[PDB]
């Protein structure tokens, strides 16, 4: 009656094991996903088998499986690049995802806190580069000093707006404020590469190996611009643009950013989005020449840091290990999971088994035979 209940329990540990200690079955079975802008179910039933890297050795193995699908998925399912940006490259996001965990999340706040608390912090910031609204703020602003309405337009262009030498002025201004408090967030990004997690930069080295070897006539630059949509776009982009939402700082209880706040930053991610890529700012706006003469400039160091960042060692030498006889320090593995989890894992297991299984002999086939029928919500 109840030896029942523990027998199987332990019969799913040992196949949780074979799955851990085995990338290929999890990575074939994430092949096997549909392409959703979420990893949430896939996320939560391949790291719960790993107990969220809990340890060592759950880290080291799942770094294995992250790498093992990763591989796969250039190899079968990238066709000509740019659809690792574009699209939504199921082993990637898991790996940012997966990052967003104690561990990425430190590695993040210890790289940009500082820099965020400085824009924080700044209450007289001013990056306005849009010559017509600079134009609005300054009739705005007489209007409030003078008591009257200007006589001048509301509504202007932005070369008759540039037209004003005050508004060239503040602009002028203001750009080498945007330019200074861009480089302030560039430079203490190319200056922590270290800080990134191994398991961050370790995959980016397994992004451009892959890449390198499926487009052999793809340029060196047209990679690494790749390599910084994973470090920079990808990992970084979204926590300086929702600093609080991303753990980079800690606002008491009940607060929030001001609105102006999370303007400067969103406008700062978009320069160093800008950057990282290469992209000139187009349209009329000549303005903004200084601006694109700086992103050229900062593409560089961008550029060598992405290449920095892949220059890891292998995972053998990493975790320090010969063997696997290595990392088995936790005497008898436990995977923490519930009945509920239980239920998702098997039946995907079964749905999927002769993908993830192709030999007809392969170990798993029997285990999951004896295993037998998915269990009830409450069996």
Same mark, same amino acid.
């Given at each position: 009656?109840?030896?029942? +209940? ?60 992250? /790498? ?28 940012? @995802? ?29 990056? +306005? ?6 134009? +609005? ?76 070897? /499926? ?30 939402? =991303?753990?980079?700082?800690?606002? @008491? ?25 290469? /992209?000139? =700012? ?13 992103? @050229? ?34 005497? +008898? ?47």
């Amino acid at each position: 009656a109840s030896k029942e +209940k523990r027998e199987k329990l332990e019969a799913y540990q040992h196949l949780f094991y074979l799955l851990q200690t085995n990338p290929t079955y999890l990575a074939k079975l994430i092949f096997q996903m549909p392409q959703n802008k979420s990893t949430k179910f896939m996320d939560s039933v391949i790291f719960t088998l790993y107990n969220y890297a809990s340890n060592q050795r759950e880290e080291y193995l799942l770094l294995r499986l992250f /790498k093992t699908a990763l591989q796969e998925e250039i190899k079968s399912k990238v066709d000509q690049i740019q659809e690792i940006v574009t699209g939504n490259p199921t082993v990637i996001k898991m790996v940012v @995802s997966f990052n967003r965990g104690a561990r990425g999340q430190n590695a993040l706040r210890q790289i940009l806190a500082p820099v965020v608390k400085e824009i924080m912090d700044d209450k007289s910031l001013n990056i +306005k580069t849009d010559p017509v609204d600079i134009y +609005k703020s300054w009739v705005n602003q007489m209007e409030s000093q003078t008591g009257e309405a200007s006589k001048l337009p509301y509504d202007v262009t932005p070369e008759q707006a540039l037209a004003h030498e005050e508004v060239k002025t503040r602009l002028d201004s203001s750009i080498r404020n945007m330019r200074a408090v861009t480089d302030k967030f560039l430079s203490a990004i190319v200056s922590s590469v270290d800080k990134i997690p191994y398991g961050m930069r370790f995959i980016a080295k397994v992004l451009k190996d892959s890449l390198h070897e /499926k487009f052999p006539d793809a340029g060196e630059d047209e990679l690494l611009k790749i390599i910084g949509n994973l470090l920079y776009y990808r990992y970084m982009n979204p926590a300086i643009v929702a600093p609080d939402a =991303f753990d980079i700082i800690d606002l @008491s209880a009940g607060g929030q950013l001001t609105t102006d706040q999370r303007r400067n930053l969103g406008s700062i991610a978009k320069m160093l989005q800008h950057a990282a890529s290469n /992209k000139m =700012f187009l349209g009329d706006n000549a303005h903004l020449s200084i601006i694109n003469e700086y992103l @050229s400039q900062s593409y560089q160091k961008f550029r060598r840091f992405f290449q920095t960042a892949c220059d890891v060692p292998e995972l053998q030498d990493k975790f320090n290990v010969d063997e696997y006889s290595d990392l088995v320090t936790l005497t +008898k593995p436990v995977i923490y999971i519930s009945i509920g989890e239980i239920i998702n894992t098997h039946t995907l297991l079964l749905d999927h088994q002769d993908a993830i299984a192709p030999e007809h002999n392969d170990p798993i086939h029997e285990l999951l035979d004896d295993l037998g029928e998915v269990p009830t919500i409450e069996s």
